[PDB]
Amino acid sequence: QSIMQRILTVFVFTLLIATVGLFIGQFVPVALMLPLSILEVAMIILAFWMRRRKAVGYAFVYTFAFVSGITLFPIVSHYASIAGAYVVLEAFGSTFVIFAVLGTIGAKMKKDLSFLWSFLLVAVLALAVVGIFNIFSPLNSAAMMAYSVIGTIVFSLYILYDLNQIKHRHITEDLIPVMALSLYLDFINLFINLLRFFGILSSD
Ligand SMILES: [Gd]
């Protein structure tokens, strides 16, 4: 009925569409698979880009959710292989409770967190730079673990912020796709960071 529920209705469908993509993604051969470095940082770059995009439709978000799902399996399989499959469940479980807890608090809190926009914008740019640096010169385990905890905190704060702005701002019906897409990217980026963190933590 309300705009918040319609956004979260779209959000759940992108999760479902992504899960089918993830299943399909297992059949991609190693020849057609991009480097792990590139795949991880591309999601940070798209999270930044898709936030500032104008006039996004329902066809874009659902097709994006599907394709991104396919390009998530290489990362999932990597960290499951180096540290056991249990880290994928730990990562997904931790993402789900963080999103539920922070999403609920953000959506019903009386304080308006609009002032954080600049703080979170520069943090994503920093992660983007360090992620791009990682392609050419790969960071060691401890720097990657440090990078992962920081990314976890930034993308946890974005969920709080995003649900908070949905309540506090006058969101028109034409922004339902773009707001759900940002929730999807926040979720996916939080998952990747927890997965890498717990992946490396159990790696040695
Ligand atoms: Gd790998």
Ion ligand 1: residue ranges with CB closer than 5 A: 78
φ and ψ at residue 94, rounded to 5 degrees: -60, -40
Dihedral sign, Cα of residue 101, residue 103, residue 104, residue 108: positive
CA angle 102, 104, 105 (to 5 degrees): 65
The domain limits of the chain are 1-204
* Contacts of residue 13, Cβ cutoff 8 Å, sequence gap at least 6: 62, 65
Per the listing, tokens 């759900």 go with: 180
φ and ψ at residue 28, rounded to 5 degrees: -75, 125
DSSP 31: T
CA of 26 to the centre of ligand 1 (A): 13
Identify which of 195, 93, 83, 94 has the alpha carbon closest to the alpha carbon of residue 147: 195
CA of 135 to the centre of ligand 1 (A): 14
Contact 70, 201 (CB under 8 A): no
User: Six-digit token pair at 39?
Assistant: 């795949």
d(CA 6, CA 9): 5
Dihedral angle computed from the Cα positions of residues 28, 18, 44 and 183, in that order, rounded to the nearest 10 degrees: 180
CA of 190 to the centre of ligand 1 (A): 19
Contact 49, 9 (CB under 8 A): no
d(CA 198, CA 195): 5
Contact 14, 181 (CB under 8 A): yes
* Contacts of residue 187, Cβ cutoff 8 Å, sequence gap at least 6: 15, 95, 99, 159
Resolution stated for this PDB structure, in Å: 2.5
Contact 106, 167 (CB under 8 A): yes
What's the farthest any 2 CA atoms get from each other in the chain?
52
